Design a protein around this ligand. Structure first.
Ligand SMILES: CCCCCCCCCCCCCC(=O)O[C@H](COC(=O)CCCCCCCCCC[C@@H](C)CCCCCCCCCCCC(=O)O[C@H](COC(=O)CCCCCCCCCC)COP(=O)(O)OCC[N+](C)(C)C)COP(=O)(O)OCC[N+](C)(C)C
Ligand SMILES: CCCCCCCCCCCCCC(=O)O[C@H](COC(=O)CCCCCCCCCC)COP(=O)(O)OCC[N+](C)(C)C
Ligand SMILES: CCCCCCCCCCCCCC(=O)O[C@H](COC(=O)CCCCCCCCCC)COP(=O)(O)OCC[N+](C)(C)C
Ligand SMILES: [Mg+2]
Lengths: 78, 138
């Protein structure tokens, strides 16, 4: 029917979209910077593939979520 | 950052690379060894040491100094740069200073007299020698 259906409230209170956008970006950006610094300073004999993979994956995850929340914060509501 | 694509490889520019890698390794090892020695001397020689944990720390420091000596000999023989004279001098001075400071601490913590000003002077001399070694290690 239509009477026994609950209203569809958002999973994340919209007032939390700004607070969540900055943080998730900042952390992300930080890690990103680290990665790039690591790729300029370290020579061929001082590079670890597992460390690079780990830091790059963390940066990618945090950055994806931050970019989503920002894109939704401006009002595109993807 | 994994593709070379170079035709004429210059070994003179690769020698500098295989020197930089080594000196970074040695700096890490020496800083870690100094930190470990200071931490062991501060956490095992407060009021009772019994010369057992101090002996284990001395054995670990001797093994670390031996590994550093092997790395210094490797960087002296194999690579093109000298990296030996200053390195061997600093390694010998640091090993002697660490052994002397450990002996003074183990004698002051297991005697009738409690050396406080002498221990402070020993720590200050160790920090001064470490500062000179850091100025000499670039
Ligand atoms: C300052 C702190 C900032 C904190 C950031 C927090 C993020 C906050 C998001 C913004 C909030 C916006 C508020 C808002 O939206 O209000 C709305 C109104 O809506 C709007 O209309 C506003 C919309 C605006 C949105 C815009 C968002 C865009 C954000 C983009 C972000 C920024 C911050 C950073 C961009 C980075 C740029 C990259 C620069 C490139 C650098 C070039 C490198 C140069 C170089 O080559 O150097 C070399 C070294 O090589 C390298 O390794 C460099 C590689 C780097 C590559 C990338 C790394 C970058 C990392 C940076 C950290 C040097 O060369 P040498 O080495 O010397 O060469 C010598 C070589 N040899 C010869 C070998 C020696 C509110 O409106 P409202 O009313 O609320 O509307 C809502 C209404 N409803 C719709 C909801 C109904
Ligand atoms: C709608 C939203 C769309 C989002 C678009 C996303 C943009 C993606 C950005 C791409 C980033 C480019 C990566 C890059 O800069 O490559 C750098 C080389 O760095 C440099 O030398 C200078 C290049 C800087 C150019 C950056 C401009 C990018 C602008 C894109 C919008 C790698 O240089 P390295 O390989 O680290 O060189 C070091 C070599 N050693 C041996 C010394 C170690
Ligand atoms: C529109 C398409 C045009 C096709 C061009 C056909 C190319 C013919 C191939 C000839 C062989 C090229 C030799 C070559 O690649 O040399 C490259 C640097 O390369 C060059 O100098 C010029 C090669 C240009 C080819 C570009 C195609 C690259 C595609 C890669 C996916 C590197 O030269 P090096 O001298 O080793 O540079 C190293 C400098 N260090 C100081 C860092 C050591
Ligand atoms: Mg959707």
């Amino acid at each position: 029917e239509l009477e026994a259906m609950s209203r569809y409230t958002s999973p994340v209170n919209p007032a939390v979209f700004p607070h969540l956008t900055v943080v998730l970006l900042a952390i992300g950006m930080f890690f990103t910077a680290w990665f790039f610094v690591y790729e300029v300073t370290s020579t061929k004999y001082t590079r670890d593939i597992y460390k690079e993979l780990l830091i790059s994956l963390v940066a990618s995850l945090f950055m994806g979520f931050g970019v989503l929340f920002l894109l939704l914060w401006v009002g595109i509501y993807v | 950052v994994r593709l070379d694509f170079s035709i004429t490889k210059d070994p003179a520019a690769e020698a500098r690379m295989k020197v930089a890698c080594i000196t970074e390794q040695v700096l890490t090892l020496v800083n870690k060894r100094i930190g470990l020695y200071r931490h062991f001397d501060e956490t095992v020689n407060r009021y009772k040491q019994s010369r057992d944990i101090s002996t284990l720390n001395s054995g670990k420091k001797s093994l670390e100094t031996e590994h550093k000596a092997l790395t210094s000999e490797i960087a002296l023989l194999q690579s093109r740069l000298k990296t030996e004279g200053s390195d061997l001098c600093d390694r010998v001075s640091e090993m002697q200073k660490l052994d002397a400071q450990v002996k003074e601490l183990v004698l002051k913590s297991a005697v009738e007299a409690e050396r406080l000003v002498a221990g402070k002077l020993k720590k200050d001399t160790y920090i001064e020698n470490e500062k000179l070694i850091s100025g000499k290690r670039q």
